[PDB]
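agent> fetching stored inputs for the magnesium ion docking request
agent> found them:
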Amino acid sequence: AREIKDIKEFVELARRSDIKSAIVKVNAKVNANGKKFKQTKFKVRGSRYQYTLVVNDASKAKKLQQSLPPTLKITNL
Amino acid sequence: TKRTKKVGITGKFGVRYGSSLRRQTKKLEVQQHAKYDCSFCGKRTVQRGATGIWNCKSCKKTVAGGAYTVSTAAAATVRSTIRRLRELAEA
Amino acid sequence: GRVIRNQRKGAGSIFTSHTRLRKGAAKLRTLDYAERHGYIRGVVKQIIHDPGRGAPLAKVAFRDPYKYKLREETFIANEGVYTGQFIYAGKKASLNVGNILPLGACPEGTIVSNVEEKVGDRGALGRTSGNYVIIIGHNPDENKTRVKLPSGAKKIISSDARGVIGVVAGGGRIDKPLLKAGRAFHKYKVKRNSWPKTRGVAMNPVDHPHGGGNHQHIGKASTISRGAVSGQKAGLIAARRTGLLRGTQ
Amino acid sequence: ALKESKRAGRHMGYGKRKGTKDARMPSQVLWMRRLRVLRKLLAKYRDAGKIDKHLYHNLYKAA
Amino acid sequence: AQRVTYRRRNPYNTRSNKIKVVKTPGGKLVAQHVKKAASRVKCGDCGSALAGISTLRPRQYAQVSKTHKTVQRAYGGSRCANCVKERIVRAFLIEEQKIVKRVLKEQQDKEK
Amino acid sequence: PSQKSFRTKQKLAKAQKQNRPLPQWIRLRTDNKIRYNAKRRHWRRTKLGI
RNA sequence: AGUGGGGAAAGGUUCCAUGUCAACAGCAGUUGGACAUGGGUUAGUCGAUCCUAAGAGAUGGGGAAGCUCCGUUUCAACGUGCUUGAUUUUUCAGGCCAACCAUCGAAAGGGAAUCCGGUUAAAAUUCCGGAACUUGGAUAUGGAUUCUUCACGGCAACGUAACUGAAUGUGGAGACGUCGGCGUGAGCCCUGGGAGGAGUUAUCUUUUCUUCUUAACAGCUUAUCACCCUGGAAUUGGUUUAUCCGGAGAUGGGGUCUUAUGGCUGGAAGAGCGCGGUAAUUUUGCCGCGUCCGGUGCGCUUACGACGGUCCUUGAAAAUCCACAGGAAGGAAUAGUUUUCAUGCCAAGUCGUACUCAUAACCGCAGCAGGUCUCCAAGGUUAACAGCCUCUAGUUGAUAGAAUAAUGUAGAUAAGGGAAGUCGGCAAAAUAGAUCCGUAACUUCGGGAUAAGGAUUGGCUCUAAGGAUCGGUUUAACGAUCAACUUAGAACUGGUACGGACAAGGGGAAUCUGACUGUCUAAUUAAAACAUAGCAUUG
RNA sequence: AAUAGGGUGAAGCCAGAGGAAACUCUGGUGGAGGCUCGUAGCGGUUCUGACGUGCAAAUCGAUCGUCGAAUUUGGGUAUAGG
Ligand SMILES: NC[C@@H]1O[C@H](O[C@H]2[C@@H](O)[C@H](O[C@@H]3[C@@H](O)[C@H](N)C[C@H](N)[C@H]3O[C@H]3O[C@H](CO)[C@@H](O)[C@H](O)[C@H]3N)O[C@@H]2CO)[C@H](N)[C@@H](O)[C@@H]1O
Ligand SMILES: NC[C@@H]1O[C@H](O[C@H]2[C@@H](O)[C@H](O[C@@H]3[C@@H](O)[C@H](N)C[C@H](N)[C@H]3O[C@H]3O[C@H](CO)[C@@H](O)[C@H](O)[C@H]3N)O[C@@H]2CO)[C@H](N)[C@@H](O)[C@@H]1O
Ligand SMILES: NC[C@@H]1O[C@H](O[C@H]2[C@@H](O)[C@H](O[C@@H]3[C@@H](O)[C@H](N)C[C@H](N)[C@H]3O[C@H]3O[C@H](CO)[C@@H](O)[C@H](O)[C@H]3N)O[C@@H]2CO)[C@H](N)[C@@H](O)[C@@H]1O
Ligand SMILES: NC[C@@H]1O[C@H](O[C@H]2[C@@H](O)[C@H](O[C@@H]3[C@@H](O)[C@H](N)C[C@H](N)[C@H]3O[C@H]3O[C@H](CO)[C@@H](O)[C@H](O)[C@H]3N)O[C@@H]2CO)[C@H](N)[C@@H](O)[C@@H]1O
Ligand SMILES: NC[C@@H]1O[C@H](O[C@H]2[C@@H](O)[C@H](O[C@@H]3[C@@H](O)[C@H](N)C[C@H](N)[C@H]3O[C@H]3O[C@H](CO)[C@@H](O)[C@H](O)[C@H]3N)O[C@@H]2CO)[C@H](N)[C@@H](O)[C@@H]1O
Ligand SMILES: NC[C@@H]1O[C@H](O[C@H]2[C@@H](O)[C@H](O[C@@H]3[C@@H](O)[C@H](N)C[C@H](N)[C@H]3O[C@H]3O[C@H](CO)[C@@H](O)[C@H](O)[C@H]3N)O[C@@H]2CO)[C@H](N)[C@@H](O)[C@@H]1O
Ligand SMILES: NC[C@@H]1O[C@H](O[C@H]2[C@@H](O)[C@H](O[C@@H]3[C@@H](O)[C@H](N)C[C@H](N)[C@H]3O[C@H]3O[C@H](CO)[C@@H](O)[C@H](O)[C@H]3N)O[C@@H]2CO)[C@H](N)[C@@H](O)[C@@H]1O
Ligand SMILES: NC[C@@H]1O[C@H](O[C@H]2[C@@H](O)[C@H](O[C@@H]3[C@@H](O)[C@H](N)C[C@H](N)[C@H]3O[C@H]3O[C@H](CO)[C@@H](O)[C@H](O)[C@H]3N)O[C@@H]2CO)[C@H](N)[C@@H](O)[C@@H]1O
Ligand SMILES: NC[C@@H]1O[C@H](O[C@H]2[C@@H](O)[C@H](O[C@@H]3[C@@H](O)[C@H](N)C[C@H](N)[C@H]3O[C@H]3O[C@H](CO)[C@@H](O)[C@H](O)[C@H]3N)O[C@@H]2CO)[C@H](N)[C@@H](O)[C@@H]1O
Ligand SMILES: NC[C@@H]1O[C@H](O[C@H]2[C@@H](O)[C@H](O[C@@H]3[C@@H](O)[C@H](N)C[C@H](N)[C@H]3O[C@H]3O[C@H](CO)[C@@H](O)[C@H](O)[C@H]3N)O[C@@H]2CO)[C@H](N)[C@@H](O)[C@@H]1O
Ligand SMILES: [Mg+2]
Ligand SMILES: [Mg+2]
Ligand SMILES: [Mg+2]
Ligand SMILES: [Mg+2]
Ligand SMILES: [Mg+2]
Ligand SMILES: [Mg+2]
Ligand SMILES: [Mg+2]
Ligand SMILES: [Mg+2]
Ligand SMILES: [Mg+2]
Ligand SMILES: [Mg+2]
Ligand SMILES: [Mg+2]
Ligand SMILES: [Mg+2]
Ligand SMILES: [Mg+2]
Ligand SMILES: [Mg+2]
Ligand SMILES: [Mg+2]
Ligand SMILES: [Mg+2]
Ligand SMILES: [Mg+2]
Ligand SMILES: [Mg+2]
Ligand SMILES: [Mg+2]
Ligand SMILES: [Mg+2]
Ligand SMILES: [Mg+2]
Ligand SMILES: [Mg+2]
Ligand SMILES: [Mg+2]
Ligand SMILES: [Mg+2]
Ligand SMILES: [Mg+2]
Ligand SMILES: [Mg+2]
Ligand SMILES: [Mg+2]
Ligand SMILES: [Mg+2]
Ligand SMILES: [Mg+2]
Ligand SMILES: [Mg+2]
Ligand SMILES: [Mg+2]
Ligand SMILES: [Mg+2]
Ligand SMILES: [Mg+2]
Ligand SMILES: [Mg+2]
Ligand SMILES: [Mg+2]
Ligand SMILES: [Mg+2]
Ligand SMILES: [Mg+2]
Ligand SMILES: [Mg+2]
Ligand SMILES: [Mg+2]
Ligand SMILES: [Mg+2]
Ligand SMILES: [Mg+2]
Ligand SMILES: [Mg+2]
Ligand SMILES: [Mg+2]
Ligand SMILES: [Mg+2]
Ligand SMILES: [Mg+2]
Ligand SMILES: [Mg+2]
Ligand SMILES: [Mg+2]
Ligand SMILES: [Mg+2]
Ligand SMILES: [Mg+2]
Ligand SMILES: [Mg+2]
Ligand SMILES: [Mg+2]
Ligand SMILES: [Mg+2]
Ligand SMILES: [Mg+2]
Ligand SMILES: [Mg+2]
Ligand SMILES: [Mg+2]
Ligand SMILES: [Mg+2]
Ligand SMILES: [Mg+2]
Ligand SMILES: [Mg+2]
Ligand SMILES: [Mg+2]
Ligand SMILES: [Mg+2]
Ligand SMILES: [Mg+2]
Ligand SMILES: [Mg+2]
Ligand SMILES: [Mg+2]
Ligand SMILES: [Mg+2]
Ligand SMILES: [Mg+2]
Ligand SMILES: [Mg+2]
Ligand SMILES: [Mg+2]
Ligand SMILES: [Mg+2]
Ligand SMILES: [Mg+2]
Ligand SMILES: [Mg+2]
Ligand SMILES: [Mg+2]
Ligand SMILES: [Mg+2]
Ligand SMILES: [Mg+2]
Ligand SMILES: [Zn+2]
Ligand SMILES: [Zn+2]
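agent> prediction call returned; pasting tokens
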């Protein structure tokens, strides 16, 4: 599994022709000194590698979720 | 302090093998573990590998020598004999 | 009786030489046009220890005169030869330590090693550490040279036969006592199975002509004829004399 | 409870010792410990300028 | 403490049957078989380890890019920097001295 | 051993198949004289030879 | 250093489930490695297969009456050669080489590639789930590069996503002995806070035990050594536990590189672990919470790193992979090249895989106190992996009952004497650890030596000594914080005991003999016999 | 492929002292050796112990030799009846 950091790079990758499905994982965490925050992991399963994008902001995650191609099957965990 | 009066390097042999055999061993074993002057770089960094093989640590020059010294007296004499015969032959 | 230890060695079962660790056969170059008419130059890459040998060996790289390739030769290292030295071999090679010259090209008194018995056999005489061959004189009409060998024998060889200038390296090895059975064990671990040796007088009469007796003793003269047969030649074979060597020979 | 007793020094008398002085505390370890303490201080003083490189070299060979 | 077993039929501590001990996500402790450590690429002139070249077991070099296996210079992955510098200087000085030795024997082919 | 050749394993399959008891319907044949398998082999008692 | 958990050899179904007691398990038997019936061993990644080792062994040949013997490139015309442009004319045109080259020979050598969780009555690195990798083949898109055609940057070490390279040549890796200390990591051991669970609780104990884990693989980052630039050194400096380096360029300043190792992240919490609440004959669950942050070290094991010693000993080969030198050939502009950059497509056949590895699965006629190669290795005491007790795991198996004469076998003790016994101190006893003191003749000066001979040793309460990391005009000669067990001494104390079990030399004066270490009569002789270095003779 | 834990303390190296010199002395460091005590291992001294129709066609018990090298050992391989 390889990690992707740039969100723009991630959406173009999600429309690669070999991408079967995707996983959206929600992790409840805490900003150390701060308080609870909700991390979301977007995982795209390609032919060779699984690509993970970590989005610590719960709102840009929701926008990203509506920015993925509608054809991909998405499993919510 | 001085640890041994006379055995030196052969104190590793204890009392065995005979004093005559141990003191005769001491001369050649001091010679074979010494550092010699490199005729190439000038440092005292030439040490023995196997018998007849003498390497310099600094300039990494290896020279063929004697069993326990870099040069035997017989070889040094031959070099001068060869040097001598070379001068007359080449005028 | 039984086959004695002399006779079991010819079959060579456990008496072959231990050669796994050997670094190649020490030979001169094959005598070619360049050595026969002029000289060729090579460079020393290595001077290495050869197991079972007191003399170190030198690996010398020459160019091949006829095809684009490097040829590595295994010479017997003469003392004073160093890594990176240029070695010159041939009729026109100069009188420097390590150069390979025909015997006729060396003046009287020249110390030479790895000498050819016959022209082109690539070295037969004076190959062990500290040993050498002295050139005593020349016979130009028949093209032959007289030399003195390490055993003290004088020999006449073709002047076209080659030799290496200098003394074989590693001499003085015998000056130090071994001091231990283990040292001889390690010495012969890479030579052959000839150590340790049981005295024939300590065997039974089946095992040896010296075996037997209610005391350990040979019983008959230990000088054996040259014309004796295998199984009898144990002791001093064709001995011209016995006893402490007194005076000059 | 023993480890506090042994830290306070109990059960360490001559009748409680089976190894030699050097197996219990090697003299080579004590020497190495000491000479690293001395070398570390000398570089601290020379690097702070409290002593110069000439006094440093003499004391390095003395240590 | 938990103890481990070999993972293969070889029961002997040979050079190719070396193991490491690793803790699993199950909180268990298993032996993990390690591959032999790679040796460094070495200089063909001086025998020193060449800088800038990855140290891998030989078959692993075929499937990795060229920048890992070379240095942008003459004799890049074969000789060290200092050994090429001596080659360049030696080649230059020796080829220059050949000219001096040639001209000197054309001057002596008109005076001697 | 666990590591065995095919030729060995094929002999061990035949050795297992030859170690059956006699099928009981064989005693009912007319003029049948065989009452039991007289060539039984236990692994610990008599060894094969592989 | 197991009666634990696996394996190699060897066995071959002994493995698992069901039934079962005629024989076998030297009593028994409802039990079994017995008997009967069924079931069970899943691989591109684990081994074979490939390579070569000591060695074995065809061929041309040469011997031999011959079975056959020799020889391994040998007095040999030794390629079932390759590489292209092709040609579709299934013909060719040619271009290169052919020192060496049949082959077998390793389940411990060499060697392409897999991990975790879960799963069975019995299989699992093989199955399920997920996540990867290698080799071979095919191949398009993106990127890269070119009008200065086959890329740029850096003084340099060298850096980069790529970024032509034939014949031929050269290197590297493959690839290696042994010992010693130092350093670092990992696992284990020890330990703090906090969040759970269990035990003790007459009394004490903020207590005792336990869960708090993170794979292969991918990215970023991380280095001693080595190297580069600068600079030019005696008042010689730098420096290791261990003394080596420097005008052949040190110290200083700044950089480059290499596996190993750590860190962060993806894999990955969804897994696994620990709790609480529940569904229900119930296949099997479902729900909720936590799974966090540290410290310590002459600790143990092991790997790596930089070093030092050693040898009349210098410590495999080959398969295989890569790089370089070289400059053949082929290459753009209205377009050219390349699959050593990324991504994408297809495939990986054959045989082994259960179980035992031993006081019951092997060999010793056997379920035999014997023999048989190897991996992992907790706490206390301790120098210690010894001995003794314990945690995990595993066993509680050895016919049994009742008695306790003689004589036994194994083991203890004994008044006074102390070898008078006896061939003979055989056997037993005595000594025994550690600290301090002290230690003869003789000697090859190395030893003798733990010579001999003396003293001390518990427990408790104290005292003293020995470090680390930071903080600034050189009184930091000090403060702050942290930290390991070592050493020395004192007071008190007790039926004078104290290496309290365990563990653990008796010593001395001489003669004969072999110098020593070493070796042999497996199964009556271990010696003064053999060997050995040294010495000498012979060819 | 395998070999606990200790003892001794050889070269080399550092510091100090004495001497006119040649040199010597002292305190450390260091970690040599077919060195040593002693496990495993390998061996097999004595009890002339046990047993001696044995557990065993060579074992058992204590005691003992050696235990870093001429060490121990697996597998492959070679040598074959005068
Ligand atoms: N003058 C000839 C000398 O032979 C010497 O040695 C020769 C021989 O003594 C030596 O013996 C070799 C043996 O090693 C190896 N097995 C090869 C060869 N068969 C043997 O050779 C021998 O056998 C041959 C028969 O073949 C006979 O001529 C003779 O008995 C003998 N030369 O091999 C050499 C020839 O092959 C030296 N090489 C050199 O001095 C010189 O060549
Ligand atoms: N490998 C062959 C080589 O050539 C030779 O080999 C020898 C053999 O071929 C043959 O020697 C025979 C031997 O076959 C046979 N079985 C024993 C006989 N004693 C030997 O004979 C030899 O030695 C004797 C004794 O000194 C002499 O009298 C006789 O002249 C001599 N030929 O002749 C050669 C000796 O003359 C060399 N001895 C040696 O380099 C090597 O063996
Ligand atoms: N992911 C970490 C490392 O990254 C490597 O990836 C790197 C390699 O592919 C290549 O690394 C180069 C390489 O040319 C050659 N080995 C020399 C150079 N020093 C390396 O350099 C690289 O690695 C260093 C070290 O972290 C980095 O600091 C540096 O930025 C980076 N360019 O360039 C990549 C850039 O990082 C390995 N692929 C990987 O297996 C390894 O774990
Ligand atoms: N420039 C040095 C080179 O030495 C070479 O000579 C050596 C090589 O041919 C061969 O050396 C091998 C090497 O080929 C191979 N790639 C592995 C390793 N690098 C070397 O190993 C050599 O040295 C190591 C040192 O520990 C030893 O263990 C090993 O026994 C020895 N063969 O063995 C020779 C003797 O050691 C050649 N003369 C040539 O390539 C060149 O001159
Ligand atoms: N694919 C072949 C393999 O590639 C490997 O490549 C590894 C390296 O490139 C890189 O290793 C880095 C290392 O560079 C860096 N300096 C330290 C870092 N901890 C390592 O990381 C790696 O190794 C550690 C263990 O040390 C693992 O815990 C970690 O998961 C793993 N990523 O990460 C890769 C992890 O597989 C190794 N070179 C070697 O095992 C082998 O060549
Ligand atoms: N770690 C130091 C460095 O790494 C290497 O050294 C490593 C080993 O090679 C070295 O081993 C020792 C060495 O300490 C000692 N002073 C000399 C000895 N000959 C070496 O031994 C070597 O000899 C054999 C020969 O067959 C080599 O094949 C093998 O690498 C190594 N065992 O010790 C190191 C172990 O960490 C390089 N030699 C060199 O770069 C440097 O010394
Ligand atoms: N491919 C199967 C592999 O080869 C063997 O299997 C092969 C053989 O049993 C059999 O091979 C026969 C051969 O026996 C017979 N004497 C000649 C016949 N032409 C072969 O046939 C085979 O081989 C030819 C090439 O020769 C192929 O072209 C053909 O496709 C193949 N069927 O045909 C099978 C197919 O190749 C092993 N038995 C098998 O275990 C292994 O996996
Ligand atoms: N000193 C060492 C210790 O001696 C201990 O042993 C002690 C006692 O067991 C031993 O007693 C032995 C007795 O066992 C043995 N079987 C016979 C002997 N007569 C006794 O000896 C005793 O009594 C005699 C009477 O004359 C006196 O000399 C004295 O009191 C004592 N030695 O006397 C020893 C003390 O002198 C243990 N063996 C052990 O802890 C350790 O070895
Ligand atoms: N280094 C020895 C030390 O002696 C210590 O104790 C020793 C002394 O301290 C002590 O002696 C003291 C004495 O100092 C003081 N001046 C008088 C006192 N009576 C003595 O004590 C004595 O008597 C007392 C009863 O009073 C009892 O405990 C016992 O009989 C004895 N210790 O008794 C020992 C006599 O030597 C410890 N016993 C020991 O652990 C420690 O190592
Ligand atoms: N029968 C009496 C006892 O059994 C012994 O038999 C020996 C072994 O059977 C027994 O087992 C050893 C031991 O280290 C441990 N307890 C188990 C280990 N697997 C075995 O170790 C060894 O066994 C054999 C034989 O010794 C070795 O050849 C082999 O290298 C090794 N595996 O240990 C004994 C040696 O210590 C001896 N017969 C005798 O000395 C001993 O007192
Ligand atoms: Mg991912
Ligand atoms: Mg003898
Ligand atoms: Mg006799
Ligand atoms: Mg006779
Ligand atoms: Mg006679
Ligand atoms: Mg006689
Ligand atoms: Mg006799
Ligand atoms: Mg006699
Ligand atoms: Mg007489
Ligand atoms: Mg004389
Ligand atoms: Mg105290
Ligand atoms: Mg010391
Ligand atoms: Mg090793
Ligand atoms: Mg059997
Ligand atoms: Mg049979
Ligand atoms: Mg134990
Ligand atoms: Mg069963
Ligand atoms: Mg019964
Ligand atoms: Mg019954
Ligand atoms: Mg059955
Ligand atoms: Mg494999
Ligand atoms: Mg195959
Ligand atoms: Mg061969
Ligand atoms: Mg043949
Ligand atoms: Mg024929
Ligand atoms: Mg064959
Ligand atoms: Mg093969
Ligand atoms: Mg074979
Ligand atoms: Mg293999
Ligand atoms: Mg699961
Ligand atoms: Mg599993
Ligand atoms: Mg199982
Ligand atoms: Mg799978
Ligand atoms: Mg570019
Ligand atoms: Mg190897
Ligand atoms: Mg070691
Ligand atoms: Mg080491
Ligand atoms: Mg460590
Ligand atoms: Mg892996
Ligand atoms: Mg490390
Ligand atoms: Mg090139
Ligand atoms: Mg299994
Ligand atoms: Mg048994
Ligand atoms: Mg047992
Ligand atoms: Mg049988
Ligand atoms: Mg019994
Ligand atoms: Mg009874
Ligand atoms: Mg009793
Ligand atoms: Mg009495
Ligand atoms: Mg009385
Ligand atoms: Mg008395
Ligand atoms: Mg009497
Ligand atoms: Mg006695
Ligand atoms: Mg004493
Ligand atoms: Mg005495
Ligand atoms: Mg007498
Ligand atoms: Mg003796
Ligand atoms: Mg004598
Ligand atoms: Mg006997
Ligand atoms: Mg004896
Ligand atoms: Mg005996
Ligand atoms: Mg003798
Ligand atoms: Mg003579
Ligand atoms: Mg020791
Ligand atoms: Mg010894
Ligand atoms: Mg001993
Ligand atoms: Mg022995
Ligand atoms: Mg016995
Ligand atoms: Mg008896
Ligand atoms: Mg009886
Ligand atoms: Mg013993
Ligand atoms: Mg064998
Ligand atoms: Mg016969
Ligand atoms: Zn030099
Ligand atoms: Zn170089």
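agent> quick read of the result: Chain A has two helices and five strands.
agent> awaiting further instructions
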